[PDB]
Amino acid sequence: TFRRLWPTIAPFKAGLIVAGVALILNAASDTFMLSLLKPLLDDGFGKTDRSVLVWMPLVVIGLMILRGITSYVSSYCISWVSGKVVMTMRRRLFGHMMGMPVSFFDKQSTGTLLSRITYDSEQVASSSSGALITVVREGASIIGLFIMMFYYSWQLSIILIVLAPIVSIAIRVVSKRFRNISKNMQNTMGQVTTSAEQMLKGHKEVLIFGGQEVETKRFDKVSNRMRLQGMKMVSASSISDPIIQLIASLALAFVLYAASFPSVMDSLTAGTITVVFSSMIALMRPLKSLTNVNAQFQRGMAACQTLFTILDSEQEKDEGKRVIERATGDVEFRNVTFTYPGRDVPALRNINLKIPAGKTVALVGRSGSGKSTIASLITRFYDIDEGEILMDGHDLREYTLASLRNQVALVSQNVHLFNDTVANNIAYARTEQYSREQIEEAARMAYAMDFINKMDNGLDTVIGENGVLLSGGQRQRIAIARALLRDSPILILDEATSALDTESERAIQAALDELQKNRTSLVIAHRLSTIEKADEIVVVEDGVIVERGTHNDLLEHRGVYAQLHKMQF
């Protein structure tokens, strides 16, 4: 169907070929083991030659060991191709899902985003190879059990294969008739049960009118009808299996009857009949399983078109060629409006903010609708709807995306830590650029050296989850170390502290003060300490900025900043 997945398997087609050559072999070994019933019943028990019961245990063991060997080889050489194509699909989804915009990550899919690399990305192969196994095994077993029947007895096999369509259609017709009859009877039972429910509903009226004897008399007939319809349903459902079994036995009796005549048959001597009929019994499983090949292959290709919709999708629009090395200027918002994708209500209205060089601006206002939003826009996590965000006499869209992200340091208490050494986390994405001495210096001046020396191995301890666990404050200080080592000229201090641990703030505030040397920062104002010492204070109210003055003058005018002090104090 959606066979753009075949090039993923083309580099490894030597496990599919081997698991077709050693699975056709498994089917042939099944049908050869089933062929032993004729030598057994003819030249073994039936005859006086005990030798056939001496080598037949050995052949049975040597064919079951061959079945096991070719069923483990057929499992390893498809679990190696259905494992490596899955590996390639997973690491190809984790090269397009790690570049595309945050909007897909925002609320389109959060928990299922890992499902689309764990469950669906393994289902695409556990169903496609599960269908290849079925088709190439039950197309070998079915051919083997056809060749066996037509080799031992074409006379009986022809009349046994002519009847199989006849028996199948007769059983299907009978089952359809009784399914329709049972469906009608179940509809009638549903109506009667609805009547019983309606009898039950009027309890408060039955009590007040005193109709307990009349209501139970009326239900003595409703329940009697429930019984007489239930036994009708059972009689119509349990008369189906006997009739279809009777039709199957009519066919079996006719096959036996055909064998009576000498012209048609009687070349069979007590092992040929047992092999043919045992194969026909064993021929039902590799038709019942074979019919589901297309259903399983389509169920394993819907879960590939899903992965292609995740993959063959919009990436991050890197429509930029201008390269900036250091934000030696001012990052300015000017009449820009933005709304979250997937929602219509503007989370951010027209904005006009100035971030002067060598100075910091505080995003005050605990409304919760406008503070976190503007923080994202500087790094182009969510692209603006229309307007302009300016960064050193340019626009963010103009600048290269890679050259923009490295200019900004998102400092927050809730900061991700990678499953790696802390020396790698502090120099994440820049391990080659920054030497160990630089990391030591950064941790020293970021006040994070106290925690790391306490750790077991020190700077090389695994810090992420599934390892050592560090409290919110340690994560904050590691973020300060990252930002200060990277020397990002722009800082977006979320300051989502949400706690005041003893001596944690005493070091965090000092580290932030040391960080904010001349680094122009758009601080999210959660702590009044930074608000008091701020070059400019700007507030947001449902995306609208109204009070923009400094912390002193904006206190005199009531507006929202004094009201924030009223709300804060």
Next chain:
Amino acid sequence: TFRRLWPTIAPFKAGLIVAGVALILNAASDTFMLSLLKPLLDDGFGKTDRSVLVWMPLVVIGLMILRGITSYVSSYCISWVSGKVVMTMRRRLFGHMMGMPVSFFDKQSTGTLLSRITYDSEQVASSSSGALITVVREGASIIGLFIMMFYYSWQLSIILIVLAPIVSIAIRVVSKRFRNISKNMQNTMGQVTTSAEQMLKGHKEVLIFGGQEVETKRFDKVSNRMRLQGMKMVSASSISDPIIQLIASLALAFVLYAASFPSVMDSLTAGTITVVFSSMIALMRPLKSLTNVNAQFQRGMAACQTLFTILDSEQEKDEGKRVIERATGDVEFRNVTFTYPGRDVPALRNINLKIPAGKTVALVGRSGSGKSTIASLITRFYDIDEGEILMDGHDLREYTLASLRNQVALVSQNVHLFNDTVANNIAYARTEQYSREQIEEAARMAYAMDFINKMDNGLDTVIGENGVLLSGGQRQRIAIARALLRDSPILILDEATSALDTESERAIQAALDELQKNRTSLVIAHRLSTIEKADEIVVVEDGVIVERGTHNDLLEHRGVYAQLHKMQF
């Protein structure tokens, strides 16, 4: 477990015995049908060419017509006892669920009460009788097939039965070892697959720091650790199934080897070996199903205690000693405190209302603070927690419930209409006492005759649900005739819905005006019309009445009623 169910089955016990004699014959007709293989293969096919194969097709049909008759006589004669005990149980549940307090119906249970007489009352027989067509059906098949196996070459059945435990435990030990090994490899998969989650979570932090060629490298090694662990999980699960077949095939090799020696080989002839081996592989399905005979007999008996809880629950406390022919007096509330069973907050504080004879008190509260439940107490739908409701000078507790509820008519718009035609529906629970002439005048006196004459059959049209489906306006009118026909002294004129229309409001109000002639009534005053002529007015705030008196004297003082009167306006 609970043979207190048995006395309901004991009267109808000669359908299980008939379905124990016509169901052993079903099993003895399958072990005889897996015995023609001896005359077929041994004497019929290999020994000669004809004769036996002309006699077989009749017996195969003759043992599949007798396997169908005794499979439908077995099913009908259990479905007659599996329906006649369910019917005899259902109407026993609908004689205790129609006499117990309304509290069980109100939020302690819901429409699942139907399931306690439709699903959980047929599951008691669909799984208890399903455990008697497995302990007798597949309990004479096992005895039938064991007699056949020992009748045919006993010296092989002992070898074949001694190897059934040894093969079974060895398959169980092998399946035990490779179920724990796969479990351990699945736990290891949980660690690495969780590590893949922690890569996706840091997408906001991945982009800003620029590390995506480094993060994809960290996933190239995590993809393997969940691929190679996926090859170990398939290599450890696909190696169990080969071995358990090889262990099973070490018995077939040994049984065939055992038959090689002279002692067993004497009559190990082909007919006396297919019937023994075809029976043993046909003996697994009886044994497998017989194990689920206490899992199904307790699934079908756990549901018996579910409805015996409903059956043996506490019925309505009919502490009745006093009987009143007619409530020719005054209903008087006096310091009545009551809470809904199931509501923590008390829904009614102290209440003291006297209803004079031939007077119409009104409960005008549109706040909805439990005005309706005040009327529930006069009918003893919910008993008073503390206090006393003096009806005709004595508390409701002494009066008989059958006698008390005959003196009250719950006139409302949500009245239930029973499935009976509308001549007993008007005279529900009293059709024997009242003749058609009274109903003719009663319906006429209530102005209901127009709707009834309009109907197809007139006074005997199926009126309830699944009948003609009258509207809400018509349903309320019949309650007026039903109350007017009975001429009960006390009325609860609910008047719940404020919806009104031309020739419906006047039509109802004219009927209510004609109804409320002496009829000392308590009106839930949602309609402003009755409030103006109401002799007394009471409004309930929280659980306690605040204003009590005539509507004129309560309008001048604003309080709650007058302000509520403005709210009504």
